[PDB]
Structure 1
Amino acid sequence: MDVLMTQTPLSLPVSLGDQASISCRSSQSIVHSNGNTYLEWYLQKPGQSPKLLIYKVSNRFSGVPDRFSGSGSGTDFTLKISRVEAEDLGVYYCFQGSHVPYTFGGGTKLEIKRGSDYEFLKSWTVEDLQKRLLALDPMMEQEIEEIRQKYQCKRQPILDAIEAK
């Protein structure tokens, strides 16, 4: 049976500076035959490819700040962000490479609590506010391109239907 990685929670609304804890549960033991546990944590920022953060359960990859911490054993693993920064926002995936097929978790979206009023951006810095603005454009063009690809799939059966007349 394939290893199922169940991630909790689906969404983690936080404020900047909060502590974050993401949990990944495996359906079975993910200890490789060589004795190592290849539990990895990836972060996909909006509009970018996934990037490796934690390898072998608890080891930080190169260039990963020490506010990221990984732990766990058996079937329960946890990724912790001590103090959430703006650059940490995105989707976090857990990943096992101990048993074929290698499987990913469902993903956990670390997003900003929007509350009821948008004055929480007043405490933000301009540079972080600009990064959030610069990130929204690739998300929009992606959502737009999905619409364009969808309608391309709806136009072809029409022409083929007129064609087969």
Structure 2
Amino acid sequence: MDVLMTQTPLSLPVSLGDQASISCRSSQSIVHSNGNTYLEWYLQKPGQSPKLLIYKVSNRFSGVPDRFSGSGSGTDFTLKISRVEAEDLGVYYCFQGSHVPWTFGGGTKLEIKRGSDYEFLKSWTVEDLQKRLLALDPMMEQEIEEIRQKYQCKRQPILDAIEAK
């Protein structure tokens, strides 16, 4: 009693203005008892919370542009981005809500090809570049807080040994 959600690929390096396609394969059929197919696509910006993008295979959530499209055929479901913009970067997750337990996908990171090289960021606008710089602070603060909580994990036994004394 478990349906596997296989997302593919794991990383989709693209340039701005290109077409992107992410697939999600279900181990079993995913039609709900009421006849619907509760296939959902979520996008998570780095350091932020996931946001619903597509629901019921091909229905766009409120606020999602027409560049995002969804499709399916039973066990294969594909999300498509016609013109990748800077706001679309992040990790995409496919999700099923037809059979308990409802399962999530592994995730597909949509990133910029050779974004580490500044020569391939000169085509970007200054506005999108400062947005990209701002997008790293939630990521860094999250990783820092993970280190802090690990040392709180280590600090508590010593604090409790002092409290016993």
Q: What TM-score, normalized by structure 1, do the two folds share?
A: 0.93
User: Between the two proteins, what is the percent identity of the paired residues?
Assistant: 99
Measure how far apart 1:157 and its partner are.
Answer: 3.2
State the 4+ residue runs in structure 1 displaced beyond 6 angstroms. Answer: 161-165
Structure 1 equivalent of residue 77 of structure 2: 77
Structure 2 equivalent of residue 12 of structure 1: 12
Query: Is the Cα contact below 8 Å between 2:115 and 2:121 reproduced in 1?
Result: no
What secondary structure does 1:31 align onto? coil
Measure how far apart 1:6 and its partner are.
Answer: 0.8
* Alpha-carbon distance change, 115 to 130 in structure 1, aligned in 2, over 3 angstroms: closer
What secondary structure does 1:104 align onto? coil
Could you tell me which runs of 5 or more consecutive residues in structure 2 were left unpaired when the two chains were aligned.
none
Query: Is the Cα contact below 8 Å between 2:16 and 2:84 reproduced in 1?
Result: yes
Distance in 2 (CA, whole Å) between partners of 1:158 and 1:80 is 52
RMSD: 1.7
Q: Deviations over 1:71-108 (max 9, x none)?
A: 11211100000110000000100010111111110111
Corresponding residue pairs, total: 165
Measure how far apart 1:162 and its partner are.
Answer: 7.3
Distance in 2 (CA, whole Å) between partners of 1:105 and 1:65 is 23
Distance in 2 (CA, whole Å) between partners of 1:17 and 1:44 is 20
What secondary structure does 1:133 align onto? helix
* Alpha-carbon distance change, 29 to 8 in structure 1, aligned in 2, over 3 angstroms: same
What secondary structure does 2:135 align onto? helix
Structure 2 equivalent of residue 138 of structure 1: 138
Measure how far apart 1:130 and its partner are.
Answer: 1.0
Matched, 1:118 2:118: yes
What secondary structure does 2:42 align onto? strand
* Alpha-carbon distance change, 52 to 116 in structure 1, aligned in 2, over 3 angstroms: closer
Q: Deviations over 1:9-55 (max 9, x none)?
A: 11111111111110101110110001110000000011211111111
Of 153-162 and 113-122, the range deviating more from structure 2: 153-162
Q: What TM-score, normalized by structure 2, do the two folds share?
A: 0.93
* Alpha-carbon distance change, 22 to 130 in structure 1, aligned in 2, over 3 angstroms: same
Distance in 1 (CA, whole Å) between partners of 2:116 and 2:88 is 23
Could you tell me which runs of 5 or more consecutive residues in structure 1 were left unpaired when the two chains were aligned.
none
What secondary structure does 1:116 align onto? coil
Measure how far apart 1:70 and its partner are.
Answer: 0.5
* Alpha-carbon distance change, 28 to 16 in structure 1, aligned in 2, over 3 angstroms: same
